[PDB]
Design a protein around this ligand. Structure first.
Ligand SMILES: NS(=O)(=O)c1ccc(C(=O)N2CCCc3ccccc32)cc1
Ligand SMILES: [Zn+2]
Length: 258
């Protein structure tokens, strides 16, 4: 009886195995745009993805991860609110059953159709497993998806999904350029928070871009054909794999822009 997104094992149950679910710095959160303060001390984000080495795509039973070679500083995030160098390890998405829900963060209570998370770990801790035990161990770059025009840079991802339909399936996924998933603007909000799935560790500097990317209805429909279940098991469509907004508590969300 493992955690998931259903009635019986979904977010409102997670606290029983993972008591930190009710913690002081849990993610995601609603971003109230009027309350978020411009911080002129914040630097522009430095997204250095030119030398990124994608390797594989994995259906892990809760989402799909596009995995990168993080054995050296190739693809890194620095600047913004961060001190030091954060290495890209994987990206994944959260999405809905319909366009009106799917994002984890919200903006003045608005839910987007989906949310991209580019996950990075602080290289001063040496490995990812060490980093997740530190308050400044991870930096997750969050990008909203709205449904409209197709995102050309996402199509390679969409087209491989048929080959990783079920939990535990993986496929070779080399030479994928995540630059193709970014919006024009790197304006962002930032706050201290957590992983949004178990083990819900409070180890993340969140950086959420203001500008959504547009994807097509056909693109997101293909996400919704994935399966939570393993091969040969009763089909459970991988939809609504998002955690709702959590209490902000004693935290401040800062804006990089006026
Ligand atoms: N949605 S997110 O961007 O906040 C996110 C969530 C979880 C993770 C993540 O590495 N996992 C989660 C589950 C298995 C696991 C086991 C031990 C340490 C970390 C992890 C990474 C990024
Ligand atoms: Zn995520």
């Amino acid at each position: 009886h493992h955690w998931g997104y259903g009635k019986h094992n979904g977010p409102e149950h997670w606290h029983k195995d993972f008591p930190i679910a009710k913690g002081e710095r849990q993610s995601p959160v609603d971003i109230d745009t009027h309350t978020a303060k411009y911080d002129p001390s914040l630097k522009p984000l430095s997204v250095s993805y030119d030398q990124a080495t994608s390797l594989r795509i994995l259906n892990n039973g809760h989402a799909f991860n596009v995995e990168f070679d993080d054995s050296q500083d190739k693809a890194v995030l620095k600047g913004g609110p961060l001190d030091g160098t954060y290495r890209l390890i994987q990206f994944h998405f959260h999405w809905g059953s319909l366009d009106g829900q799917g994002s984890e963060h919200t903006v003045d209570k608005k839910k987007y159709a989906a949310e991209l998370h580019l996950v990075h770990w602080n290289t001063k801790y040496g490995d990812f497993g060490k980093a997740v035990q530190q308050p400044d161990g991870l930096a997750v770059l969050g990008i909203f998806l709205k449904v409209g025009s197709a995102k050309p840079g996402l199509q390679k991802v969409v087209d491989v999904l048929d080959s990783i339909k079920t939990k535990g399936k993986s496929a070779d996924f080399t030479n994928f350029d995540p630059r193709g998933l970014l919006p024009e603007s790197l304006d962002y909000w930032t706050y201290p928070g957590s992983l949004t799935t178990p083990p819900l560790l409070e180890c993340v500097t969140w950086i959420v871009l203001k500008e959504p990317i547009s994807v097509s209805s056909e693109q997101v429909l293909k996400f919704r054909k994935l399966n939570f279940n393993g091969e040969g098991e009763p089909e459970e469509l991988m939809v609504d794999n998002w955690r709702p907004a959590q209490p902000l508590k004693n935290r401040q969300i800062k804006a990089s822009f006026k």
